Each structure stands twice: as C-alpha cells, then as structure tokens.
Amino acid sequence: GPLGSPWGSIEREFEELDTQRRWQPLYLEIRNESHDYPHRVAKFPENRNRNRYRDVSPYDHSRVKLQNAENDYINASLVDIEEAQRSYILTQGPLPNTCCHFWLMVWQQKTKAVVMLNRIVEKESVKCAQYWPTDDQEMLFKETGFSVKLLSEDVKSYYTVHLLQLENINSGETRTISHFHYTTWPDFGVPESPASFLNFLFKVRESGSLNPDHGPAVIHCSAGIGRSGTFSLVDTCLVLMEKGDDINIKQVLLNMRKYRMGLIQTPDQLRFSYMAIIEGAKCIKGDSSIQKRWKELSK
Ligand SMILES: CC(C)CCN1CC(c2cc(O)c(N3CC(=O)NS3(=O)=O)c(F)c2)C1
C-alpha cells in the first residue's frame, strides 16, 4: 500500500488545515452538504412537552420507538454503522416528565452503559434533569414501572463512574447499569486534553459495553448532538482504522449525520476530533511488526 503510517493521511490533512487556517471553511462545507430528512412525528402537538429544544429533532426513519405505550415517541435516534459493528443511541438530556420514558428505553433496548457528557447546571441554566439518585434512597418512575438505586461511586479529577441497579417492577427483574459521567466538558466547548478524553473512552471500552453482544449504549449531553456527536465520531473512526480501512473523516461524519441532525456544533469541536483520532491511533495494539515500530518512533 502507501508509504505513510496508519494515521499519516489524517495527520497531513490536519497540518494543512492549520497552516491555511481553513477549519471554519471546512465546517461550513459540512453544514451545506448535510441533507435534511422528514421529522413529522417530532412536530405533532401531543409531543411538544417531550422536546427540550424546538430546533433539535430526531428523523422519522431512525427514531427509537417505545414499545407497549399509547404514545411511542422519545427524542432519541439509532446510529448504526455496520462497517464498524457499532450501534449507539444518541438522545437529549431528559426533562422531569420524560425521565420515565428514558429508563423504559434503556430496558427495552438491552443497554448496558449510559455515557453522560454534560453537567446538570451550566452557565446558570438547567441542562438535564436529576434522573439517578445521589444517596441511598430508591428513585421511583411510576408512569412506566421502574425504580433506580445507587450501588457504588468512584470519583476522579475529570470524570466519575456510578454503578446503578435498574428494577423492572412489572417483570420482577433487575440489571446493573454502568453510568460514565464526564464532568469537565463545557457546552459548545472541548475537553481538557486529548489524553483526558482518551483515558475516558478506554474505560468505557474496557467494560465491554460497546461490544456487539450487548444492546446499543445510550450517549447524551444537553441536546444530544454537539458533545455526543464528537464522542461517537472519534470512537467509530478508531474502530475503522483498527480493521484496516483507509478513512476520510469528512465522509464518515456526513454519513453519521444521516441518522441524527447536527452532530458536531463548532469548528473547534471538529479540530479536537482530528487530534483525538491521531493520538488514539498511536495507542492501538496489534500483531503487525511494522505497526509496532511506527508506534515506538512516534511516542
Ligand atoms: C438558535 C436557537 C434559538 C436554537 C435553540 N437551541 C438549540 C440549542 C442547543 C444546541 C446544542 O447543540 C447544544 N449543545 C452544544 C454541545 O457542545 N453539546 S449540546 O448539549 O448538543 C445546546 F446545549 C443547546 C439551543
């Protein structure tokens, strides 16, 4: 094949964008080439109190449906990329009256992990409801028949992991859910460092929660598009390079935007994605002797 390293094509494109200061023009191309798709159900009058933001809706062809309910609607989208054997659900931070629907979805889809990338309060405004308990009291969701209990808490400098017990009162079953909370990523902002973000993604992966033997993981922030889209694009692109595909980041992002509108919301969020994909690629382990030498010489 080509003479470069596994990440060489992406790294040279990054340097060229920096030197010519072309991050804003590229972000504008992506916005202009993103097609729109029908989102009629989201706009029904009966669903107005189920949406956090009037300008952020799931498309009809990929929305997640609630089963055995009179109104099947939730502001959530299935993003499935079968070239990488990866499936995700991207969703808004639930409102006080949609927390019950959020846990019904987690149960019906056989999810093992929830990845949360926002704080409850940001710049003096509420961004998400308190949908899990912080002490030893059980938290009851009576509309859909679930209860939630805190089992364990592990607090680090820039993220926290909660283990939660989710009880289906109607079926007499419980499951253990892993709750991965990144606590230092600002709204319309970027994480502290590539190294910080990547340590977090490796913890999510090590738990097995993204593997094809579980249901899709639930990823959310406040609207479910800016920070959630950054996390999913970086993870998907790293899987594709691991399997050997020669990838074009603009092309992969446009394809993922066919499943949910607006993923990645600023030019600096796009630039951070390139940096995390390059630095992460240098961490992957494998059997190739050639690949291992590239890693040692680039550290
Ligand atoms: C022009 C206005 C009248 C439109 C009304 N809106 C849409 C809003 C919105 C969009 C977002 O993309 C985000 N996020 C930023 C990110 O970095 N992650 S996010 O949680 O998705 C957000 F917090 C809020 C506000």
Query: Is 10 flagged in the annotation as binding?
Result: no
The answer to whether position 210 is within a domain reads yes
The answer to whether position 2 is within a domain reads no
How far does the centroid of ligand 1 lie from the alpha carbon of residue 75, in Å? 14
Tally the domains of the chain.
1
Q: What angle do CA 52, 88, 208 make, to 5 degrees?
A: 130
The answer to whether position 63 is within a domain reads yes
Could you tell me which residues are beta bridge partners of residue 115?
180, 219
How far does the centroid of ligand 1 lie from the alpha carbon of residue 256, in Å? 18
Residue with tokens 């969703």: 91
The answer to whether position 200 is within a domain reads yes
CA nearest ligand 1 atom 11, residue = 223
Residue ranges making up the domain that contains 86: 8-298
The answer to whether position 275 is within a domain reads yes
How far does the centroid of ligand 1 lie from the alpha carbon of residue 142, in Å? 30
Cβ–Cβ < 8 Å for 77, 63: yes
Residue 119: C-alpha distances to residues 112, 226, 233, 286 (Å): 21, 14, 21, 36
Cβ–Cβ < 8 Å for 99, 141: yes
The answer to whether position 1 is within a domain reads no
DSSP string, the chain: --SS-TTHHHHHHHHHHHHTT-HHHHHHHHHHHPPP---TGGGSGGGGGG-S-TT----TTTBPPPSS-SS---SEEEEEEGGGTEEEEEEPPPPTTTHHHHHHHHHHTT--EEEE-S-SEETTEE-S---S-SSSS-EEETTTTEEEEEEEEEE-SSEEEEEEEEEETTTTEEEEEEEEEE-S--TT---S-HHHHHHHHHHHHHTTTTSTTSPPEEEESSSSSHHHHHHHHHHHHHHHHHHT----HHHHHHHHTTTSTT-S-SHHHHHHHHHHHHHHHTT---S-HHHHHHHHHH-
Q: What CATH number should be reported for the domain holding residue 87?
A: 3.90.190.10
d(CA 222, CA 127): 5
Could you tell me which residues are beta bridge partners of residue 179?
114, 162
Query: Is 187 flagged in the annotation as binding?
Result: yes
The answer to whether position 253 is within a domain reads yes
Identify the residues whose C-beta falls under 6 Å from ligand 1: 53, 55-56, 118, 187-188, 221-227, 265
Give the position, in ligand 1's atom list, of the atom nearest the Cα of 127.
23
Q: Give the residue among 81, 79, 89 at the shortest CA–CA distance from 247.
A: 81
